[PDB]
Amino acid sequence: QASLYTHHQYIAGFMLCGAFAHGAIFFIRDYDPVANKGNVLARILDHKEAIISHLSWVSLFLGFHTLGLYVHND
Amino acid sequence: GPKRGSRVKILRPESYWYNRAGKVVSCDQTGIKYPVTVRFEDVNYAGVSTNNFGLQEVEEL
Amino acid sequence: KVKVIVDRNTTDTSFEKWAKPGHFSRTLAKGPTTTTWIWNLHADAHDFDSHTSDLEDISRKVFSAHFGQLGIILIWLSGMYFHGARFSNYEAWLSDPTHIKPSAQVVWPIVGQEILNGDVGGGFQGIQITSGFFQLWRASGITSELELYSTALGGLLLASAMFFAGWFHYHKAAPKLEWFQNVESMMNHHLAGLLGLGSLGWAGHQIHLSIPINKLLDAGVDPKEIPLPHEFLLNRELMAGLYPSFSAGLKPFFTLNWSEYSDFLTFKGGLNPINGGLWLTDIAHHHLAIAVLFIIAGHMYRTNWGIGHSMKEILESHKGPFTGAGHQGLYEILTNSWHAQLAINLALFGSLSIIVAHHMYAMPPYPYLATDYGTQLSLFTHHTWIGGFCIVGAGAHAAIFMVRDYDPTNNYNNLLDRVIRHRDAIISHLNWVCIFLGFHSFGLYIHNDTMSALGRPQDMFSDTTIQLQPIFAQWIQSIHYAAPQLTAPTASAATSLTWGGDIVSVGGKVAMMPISLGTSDFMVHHIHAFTIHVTALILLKGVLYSRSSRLIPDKANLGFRFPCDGPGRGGTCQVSAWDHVFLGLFWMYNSLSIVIFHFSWKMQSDVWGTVSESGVSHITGGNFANSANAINGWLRDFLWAQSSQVIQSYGSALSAYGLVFLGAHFVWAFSLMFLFSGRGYWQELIESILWAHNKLKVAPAIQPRALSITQGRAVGVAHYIFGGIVTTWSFFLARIIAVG
Amino acid sequence: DIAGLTPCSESKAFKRRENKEVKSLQKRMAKYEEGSAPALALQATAERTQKRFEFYGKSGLLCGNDGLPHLIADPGLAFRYGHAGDIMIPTVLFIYMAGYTGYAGREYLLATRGEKKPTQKEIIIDVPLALKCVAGSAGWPLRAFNDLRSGSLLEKEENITVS
Amino acid sequence: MQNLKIYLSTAPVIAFIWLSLLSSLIIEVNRFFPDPLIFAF
Amino acid sequence: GDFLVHHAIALGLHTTTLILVKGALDARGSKLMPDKKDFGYSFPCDGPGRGGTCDISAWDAFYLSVFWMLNTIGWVTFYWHWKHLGIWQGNVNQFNESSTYLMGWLRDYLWLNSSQLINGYNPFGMNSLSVWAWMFLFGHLVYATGFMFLISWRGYWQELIETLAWAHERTPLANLVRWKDKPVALSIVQARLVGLAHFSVGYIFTYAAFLIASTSGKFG
Amino acid sequence: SHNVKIYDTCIGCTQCVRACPTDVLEMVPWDGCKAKQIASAPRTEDCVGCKRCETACPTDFLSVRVYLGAETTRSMGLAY
Ligand code: CLA
Ligand code: CLA
Numbered sequence A: 001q002a003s004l005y006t007h008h009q010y011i012a013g014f015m016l017c018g019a020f021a022h023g024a025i026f027f028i029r030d031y032d033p034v035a036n037k038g039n040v041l042a043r044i045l046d047h048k049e050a051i052i053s054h055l056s057w058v059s060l061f062l063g064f065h066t067l068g069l070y071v072h073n074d
Numbered sequence B: 001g002p003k004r005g006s007r008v009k010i011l012r013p014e015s016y017w018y019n020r021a022g023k024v025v026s027c028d029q030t031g032i033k034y035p036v037t038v039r040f041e042d043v044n045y046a047g048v049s050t051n052n053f054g055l056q057e058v059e060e061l
Numbered sequence C: 001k002v003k004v005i006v007d008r009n010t011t012d013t014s015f016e017k018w019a020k021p022g023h024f025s026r027t028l029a030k031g032p033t034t035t036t037w038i039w040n041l042h043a044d045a046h047d048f049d050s051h052t053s054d055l056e057d058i059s060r061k062v063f064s065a066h067f068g069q070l071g072i073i074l075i076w077l078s079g080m081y082f083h084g085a086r087f088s089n090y091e092a093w094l095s096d097p098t099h100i101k102p103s104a105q106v107v108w109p110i111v112g113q114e115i116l117n118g119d120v121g122g123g124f125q126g127i128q129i130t131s132g133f134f135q136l137w138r139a140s141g142i143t144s145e146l147e148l149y150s151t152a153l154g155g156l157l158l159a160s161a162m163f164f165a166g167w168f169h170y171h172k173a174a175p176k177l178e179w180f181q182n183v184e185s186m187m188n189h190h191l192a193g194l195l196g197l198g199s200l201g202w203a204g205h206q207i208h209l210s211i212p213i214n215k216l217l218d219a220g221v222d223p224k225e226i227p228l229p230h231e232f233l234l235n236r237e238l239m240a241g242l243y244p245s246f247s248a249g250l251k252p253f254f255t256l257n258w259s260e261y262s263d264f265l266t267f268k269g270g271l272n273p274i275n276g277g278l279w280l281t282d283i284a285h286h287h288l289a290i291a292v293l294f295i296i297a298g299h300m301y302r303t304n305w306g307i308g309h310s311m312k313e314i315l316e317s318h319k320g321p322f323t324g325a326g327h328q329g330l331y332e333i334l335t336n337s338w339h340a341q342l343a344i345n346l347a348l349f350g351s352l353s354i355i356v357a358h359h360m361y362a363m364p365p366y367p368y369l370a371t372d373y374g375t376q377l378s379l380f381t382h383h384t385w386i387g388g389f390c391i392v393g394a395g396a397h398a399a400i401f402m403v404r405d406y407d408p409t410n411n412y413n414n415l416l417d418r419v420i421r422h423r424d425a426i427i428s429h430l431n432w433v434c435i436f437l438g439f440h441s442f443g444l445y446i447h448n449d450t451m452s453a454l455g456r457p458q459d460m461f462s463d464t465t466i467q468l469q470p471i472f473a474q475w476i477q478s479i480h481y482a483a484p485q486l487t488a489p490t491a492s493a494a495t496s497l498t499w500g501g502d503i504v505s506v507g508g509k510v511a512m513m514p515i516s517l518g519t520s521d522f523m524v525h526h527i528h529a530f531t532i533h534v535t536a537l538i539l540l541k542g543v544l545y546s547r548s549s550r551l552i553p554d555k556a557n558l559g560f561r562f563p564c565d566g567p568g569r570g571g572t573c574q575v576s577a578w579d580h581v582f583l584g585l586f587w588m589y590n591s592l593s594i595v596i597f598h599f600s601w602k603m604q605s606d607v608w609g610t611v612s613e614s615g616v617s618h619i620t621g622g623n624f625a626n627s628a629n630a631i632n633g634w635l636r637d638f639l640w641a642q643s644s645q646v647i648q649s650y651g652s653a654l655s656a657y658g659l660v661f662l663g664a665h666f667v668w669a670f671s672l673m674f675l676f677s678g679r680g681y682w683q684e685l686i687e688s689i690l691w692a693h694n695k696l697k698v699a700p701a702i703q704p705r706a707l708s709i710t711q712g713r714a715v716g717v718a719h720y721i722f723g724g725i726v727t728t729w730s731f732f733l734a735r736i737i738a739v740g
Numbered sequence D: 001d002i003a004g005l006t007p008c009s010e011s012k013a014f015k016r017r018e019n020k021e022v023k024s025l026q027k028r029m030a031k032y033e034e035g036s037a038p039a040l041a042l043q044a045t046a047e048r049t050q051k052r053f054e055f056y057g058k059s060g061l062l063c064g065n066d067g068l069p070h071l072i073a074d075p076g077l078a079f080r081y082g083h084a085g086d087i088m089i090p091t092v093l094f095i096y097m098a099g100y101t102g103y104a105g106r107e108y109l110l111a112t113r114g115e116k117k118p119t120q121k122e123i124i125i126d127v128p129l130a131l132k133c134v135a136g137s138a139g140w141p142l143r144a145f146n147d148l149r150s151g152s153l154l155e156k157e158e159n160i161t162v163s
Numbered sequence E: 001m002q003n004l005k006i007y008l009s010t011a012p013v014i015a016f017i018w019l020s021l022l023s024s025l026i027i028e029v030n031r032f033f034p035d036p037l038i039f040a041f
Numbered sequence F: 001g002d003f004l005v006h007h008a009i010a011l012g013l014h015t016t017t018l019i020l021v022k023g024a025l026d027a028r029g030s031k032l033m034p035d036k037k038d039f040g041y042s043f044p045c046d047g048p049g050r051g052g053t054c055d056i057s058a059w060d061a062f063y064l065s066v067f068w069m070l071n072t073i074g075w076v077t078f079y080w081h082w083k084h085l086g087i088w089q090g091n092v093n094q095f096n097e098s099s100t101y102l103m104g105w106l107r108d109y110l111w112l113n114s115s116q117l118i119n120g121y122n123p124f125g126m127n128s129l130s131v132w133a134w135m136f137l138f139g140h141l142v143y144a145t146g147f148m149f150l151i152s153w154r155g156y157w158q159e160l161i162e163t164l165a166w167a168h169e170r171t172p173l174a175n176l177v178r179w180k181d182k183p184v185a186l187s188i189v190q191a192r193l194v195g196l197a198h199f200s201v202g203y204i205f206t207y208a209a210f211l212i213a214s215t216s217g218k219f220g
Numbered sequence G: 001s002h003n004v005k006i007y008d009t010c011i012g013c014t015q016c017v018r019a020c021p022t023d024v025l026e027m028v029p030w031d032g033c034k035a036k037q038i039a040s041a042p043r044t045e046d047c048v049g050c051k052r053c054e055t056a057c058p059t060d061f062l063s064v065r066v067y068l069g070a071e072t073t074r075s076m077g078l079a080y
């Protein structure tokens, strides 16, 4: 079981990190802002920071507090 | 057209001052592509405090 | 010619310029535009070549600031004696040293941290001490607590004299250039004045204090009956009882028969098998013998009177056929530039520390350093690292001289010149020597690793298997144990016991026994050699290619410290001469770290542990030459095995090592963030967060900018080394403080 | 009780956990005759430690099998079943602790904003102007709502974006 | 005294002084009110 | 212990997305360099101008995700393993007691498991885990090799090859034997890619050996 | 060979042309400029890629942008 459960977690990790890479290669090349004007893809690029900034809050919240508790418990 | 010293907002898409207020230091009476010259209290990444713009971009407030 | 020649009221002592940060360099005085101005301030604060030009302004700032460091060191020494005064158990240690463990620091009770106070001895609770003050203070004949307060105050008093000297010699009376240009005076004085007199002065302390006192102690008296120090030099008949030759007075010194003093001035060698230290009679005969020799050596430079050498003649009169003009340029380099004279100093004065780490180890010159193993270990690891950094200092500042202070017009067809010219040969050969040792030094473990795991022990280089033995090193130890016969006719015995001598015990502990050099000892030194070469490759390459390399012809004009030139040419990333010091610190770190793991677990294997009478069972039971041949046994027998002391401690006295142990992992792993990442990703991300603060109108007026390239590289090395050294600090102490 | 837990006062391993510490502590202080402060310092900690046990048992924390007191997040659980002091009360304390310094940082940047050069005003604080803000920041919840509804909290749409 | 104040108003000074006022306070709150897990008192 | 870990897991999922969600949205452009649409996809940098752009691209953004991918998966596969170990070994108290503080992870899960693995190559003899005893070392040495590529950047090595291509060129008996393709320090992006390969190949083989040979040594 | 191309935004400061270690950029006279001067890149051959140009542009967003192409004997700057 161990040799399996780890296999499908790692092999699931790489695949998502590739899902986003080709997500970038999309935006870097074959995305067209003209035909997409006002679409749902263009609305996201319209607010980049909100998505970027809030992931930066959640990742810090879990950052300080999760580590902050392990250190306190230590 | 636009006059010196009067405040401005800049709509130029690629810029560090895009949608940021600035004060015209000089406006040329000429046919220059980019006549107007603004000045910003803020600093660019390059350390640049001033730049030239086109009339179609600068808008005075 | 040699005069005092000082200015007056040069600067103005006031706070005017404290309120104006960055006042020194013309670029910083303009106040922060961005957040980097906060960082660019600190890196430029002590760089005095950016501040100013002339050597009058630079040197004054340099000289006046040495008083600062000395004013800090003395507040430090004062503090260490004070905590010996009030908070130490010293008296209790002083009476029963073979048992009580040394302690000074005491922890306030709050926040449940008073558990850090360990039960130690003398009815006391506090932190262990690995520093070794107690085993110095015994050798200085300091008994009561009053001597310590007198040093604490006297040390803290003279510290205040230094800062005044610092103030006085920059603001008020500042020497001129010509004064700092006198080397031959300066060298007559330092060599005779500091080291010559400073040895006599100390040779006069030992004779009238330590020698008498440390005889009354190991004779079995205790500090309660010991006469006060001023009793010794103010009473002859008291002193003459200890050593009868004081009844002879100063006549034997003047009547020119010194064999008279053979009682209190000896030549012995070997360890005193009571305290374990070196016999303290000859240490006085040591400093005395040196002091006489330094004062001699301080007279070889002429100053006013036309007796003694000059420098410029000594150098410029050496010209070989191979070397062209020899040394004609070196004099006006070393008197006209600090970084040149700093690289030379940090070179030796760095590696001198590492040399000390062997001697204080191999022949401990203190009473009872043996019975405390944590102190001998903590002082072998300490001085190596401190000697390790100060070597990389030589690598960094020699590169600073090239880039900045170096001009061709002075040295043409010089020894410096002719080196820059063939540099491609030097670096190339050194680069081959490393690859050579790379496979031979290291690779032989991989053979030993593999041949093990394939179940063929007949192969792995070992003692039973293929013999690789340090012939020469073994052969050296032969001479020195045969030395006190003919090559050393007047002696008690050999210098130290690591040679072919016999074991020595105190308190049921092994002071020092001999050390045997086997195959596993052979294989390691070549790994020491492998690292020491590779880390020379990196620093030398930094010096020779600092000016300009074959691929970047202008490199000097880009400064000492710069990021890449281009992304072009396949990228120039990290080509500068600040960046070869970046790289040298990971090889320094690596080089020295294994120097220790060689030491620590050789010394536990083949020396330390309790004297068992029969068997002399060591700490690890004497597994090294068998235990570690391959990298196999370095995980198991060393890191894994040895680290079961630090991990099991929580709720114990040494538990603070268990926290730091992990805490040094976190800071190390944290470093990788700054080394692996790159700026432009971090500057893009900050662009987003500003949108958040803007949206809330909280935007600061000092614009956040991500760390500069070389900034992120420095803070990357800062932690990688920091977090990595603090582990071994916590790993050693928790180990031995429990075991030793 | 709750979540298969028990109040620490009626726990058992918790009572081991309290009375195993004093034993290991007192057997240690038998090495110091009472004329030594270490006999006093260890004594004072054993009496200090027992105080907290009678405190944790009294206050009603929930110790699981291990005997170590746990907490409970949900308001509907903490509140109704009586112990909210674990988070639910101090989660209010913190916000007023954190927002206070949070909102006191926003006014200072406002007050120091309009000037000749706000930059030097960020390095070197004028503590009086910072004190007037530290004072003014109190009751920020009511002063945040008002900058919220008046429309003065946000900077609206003159922010800068990229593409 | 003019310029001594302006220096004492620099960023790192207050950063030291004012944290050492919290640090001290938060230390002594634990001196009189030890071991505060939950707000129960 | 179950509680505190699921936040680390939750942490790892955000900072992995945070990187990747950034690289996608800034692939088009950001305030620093708003040409990246037309400058290519994977490119080393815009040069040390206007603040010294580095990793400015969207490949370098992805590049940084892997390092977090290998944590948030490492935390999982750890947290899965040592909750189960206790359950396979018949005791729930090794985890939920020592799972809270970070030392048990090191002191209990790592310390006990390592005892069986390191005895494979033992100079006393080969265990049946000597297969994994070796590889567990092969796992580190690759991981450790991976730092040489990630840390040391190119310009240092390009000046070193210069000295060698000079020596081989002017040395005797090797004059006669020369290269067709002039050797050069490999490209900026090429190294990071090579670097992250070693990092992963080493990151996997250690935990692949530790996991298998812990449960093969004990058998739960 | 690298690509280097120049834009309307030039002030003609010459500060690029002073930078190129291979002397690619060369100032061509022009009209619409304030100083009536515009850079230009006759040699895309010898652009090494230093991007010392792009650092020197006083313009807000650059008047020159070097687009790295393939890399030849020259554009690798080989002494070998
Ligand atoms: C079915 C899935 C799938 C498919 C069809 C593609 C297809 C593509 N990807 Mg992609 N990718 C995927 C999954 C996939 N990817 C995943 C899961 C990730 C995350 C890891 C990525 C990350 C990724 C990046 C970052 C990039 C691509 C690129 C590309 C394009 C060119 C690939 C190339 O040049 O490879 C050629 C072949 C190689 C490069 C082989 C290199 C070997 C690699 C480094 C592995 C070496 C480690 C090795 C296994 C160790 C052996 C161990 C042993 C010794 C013990 C192509 C369209 C590239 C692109 O389009 O750029 C414009 C690009 O930059 N992809
Ligand atoms: C016998 C004469 C003598 C002695 C003992 C010293 C001693 C010293 N010099 Mg020195 N010097 C001398 C003559 C002398 N100098 C002359 C004639 C010149 C002119 C060329 C210099 C120029 C000079 C420079 C340029 C520098 C020194 C430095 C030093 C210090 C060495 C650094 C160190 O680790 O100190 C170890 C420190 C101790 C062991 C503590 C003892 C210190 C006490 C105060 C003794 C100092 C006596 C000294 C001669 C001053 C006495 C006169 C004064 C009180 C009026 C040391 C205090 C370096 C230094 O530290 O700068 C400050 C340095 O950079 N000297």
Ligand code: CLA
Residues within 6 Å of the ligand: C431, C434, C435, C437, C438, C439, C442, C443, C446, C534, C537, C538, C583, C586, C587, F141, F144, F145, F146, F147, F148, F151, F152
């Ligand atoms: C464990 C990680 C690791 C390893 C193995 C190396 C290895 C090396 N580094 Mg290093 N380096 C590292 C981490 C590492 N580095 C890190 C983290 C940094 C960051 C600061 C650096 C920074 C650095 C610098 C700055 C320099 C080096 C240099 C060197 C080389 C020294 C010459 C040598 O020993 O070659 C001998 C090879 C070995 C010891 C590897 C052992 C492998 C065995 C013996 C051979 C295998 C046999 C066979 C081929 C198997 C393959 C067959 C298969 C294909 C079927 C060597 C290639 C120096 C250099 O190149 O100049 C000499 C140099 O200047 N490195």
Ligand code: CLA
Residues within 6 Å of the ligand: A053, A054, A056, A057, A060, C689, C692, C693, C696, C698, D101, D102, D103, D104, D105, D106, D108, D125, D130, D133, D134
């Ligand atoms: C006092 C001013 C102030 C204010 C009002 C804010 C407000 C905000 N910051 Mg923030 N920040 C500040 C200072 C401030 N920050 C400083 C000084 C730094 C670092 C140099 C940061 C670094 C930072 C990052 C990296 C992030 C934020 C984020 C946020 C937002 C979410 C709040 C949060 O979780 O932050 C948590 C806060 C931190 C992690 C660090 C704050 C440390 C303290 C508060 C700074 C010291 C304040 C200062 C000394 C006050 C002086 C008062 C005196 C002059 C009167 C919010 C808009 C996050 C965001 O955008 O999400 C929406 C985010 O990702 N900030």
Ligand SMILES: CC1=CCCC(C)(C)[C@H]1/C=C/C(C)=C/C=C/C(C)=C/C=C/C=C(C)/C=C/C=C(C)/C=C/C1=C(C)CCCC1(C)C
Residues within 6 Å of the ligand: A019, A020, A022, A023, A024, A026, A027, F024
């Ligand atoms: C960045 C990028 C480039 C350009 C285009 C592109 C679309 C590729 C874009 C996006 C890339 C990627 C990979 C985006 C998203 C990835 C991820 C993490 C997708 C995962 C989504 C998870 C989802 C829905 C889960 C939904 C809810 C679930 C299961 C649970 C349902 C249920 C509950 C909770 C209780 C049980 C019963 C029931 C009702 C079924």
Ligand code: SF4
Residues within 6 Å of the ligand: C563, C564, C565, C566, C567, C571, C572, C573, C574, C678, C709, F044, F045, F046, F047, F048, F052, F053, F054, F055, F153, F188
């Ligand atoms: S990216 Fe960082 S490293 Fe690569 S070139 Fe530009 S600056 Fe040098």
Ligand code: SF4
Residues within 6 Å of the ligand: G009, G010, G011, G012, G013, G014, G015, G016, G017, G038, G039, G056, G057, G058, G059, G062, G063, G064
């Ligand atoms: S390119 Fe930039 S620098 Fe060269 S001239 Fe036009 S503006 Fe001046």
Ligand code: SF4
Residues within 6 Å of the ligand: C568, G002, G004, G019, G020, G021, G022, G023, G024, G025, G046, G047, G048, G049, G050, G051, G052, G053, G054, G066
């Ligand atoms: S990059 Fe190409 S163009 Fe820009 S300076 Fe270097 S060589 Fe001249």
